[PDB]
Design a binder for this molecule. Structure first.
Ligand SMILES: *SCCNC(=O)CCNC(=O)[C@H](O)C(C)(C)COP(=O)(O)OP(=O)(O)OC[C@H]1O[C@@H](n2cnc3c(N)ncnc32)[C@H](O)[C@@H]1OP(=O)(O)O
Ligand code: F3S
Length: 81
């Protein structure tokens, strides 16, 4: 399975992610992206139908704040860094 999460400390509101995968990434009140599947905790498996969009957002983010992994992040966007 794939999991995704936004590192809110490195996100600078580039806005590429919400457009590429609106069913995965949205913006909080401060304009910072987060994953709507699981309240940005990187624990819900990304639906198969949304993998391509996820990849588009992952590749498009200028700050590499979107992370993609094969195991849950359990809330830590830098777990695999
Ligand atoms: S990043 C936010 C803080 N930065 C700024 O405000 C920077 C001013 N913008 C820039 O200098 C350029 O936008 C970036 C991309 C930061 C540096 O350019 P890149 O050469 O790395 O190039 P890309 O052009 O491929 O970025 C493409 C995409 O970025 C998304 N995008 C660009 N500009 C915007 C705005 N204004 N709003 C939303 N998205 C924007 C698009 O998703 C686009 O990429 P896709 O790969 O097609 O999804
Ligand atoms: S900088 Fe933030 S707004 Fe989305 S494209 Fe990258 S996570």
């Amino acid at each position: 399975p794939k999991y995704t999460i936004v590192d809110k400390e490195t996100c600078i509101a580039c806005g590429a992610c919400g457009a590429a995968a609106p069913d995965i990434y949205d913006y909080d009140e401060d304009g910072i992206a987060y994953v709507t599947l699981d309240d940005n905790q990187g624990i819900v498996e990304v639906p198969d139908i949304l993998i391509d969009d996820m990849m588009d957002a992952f590749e498009g983010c200028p700050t590499d704040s979107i992370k993609v992994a094969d195991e849950p992040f359990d809330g830590d966007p830098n777990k695999f860094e």
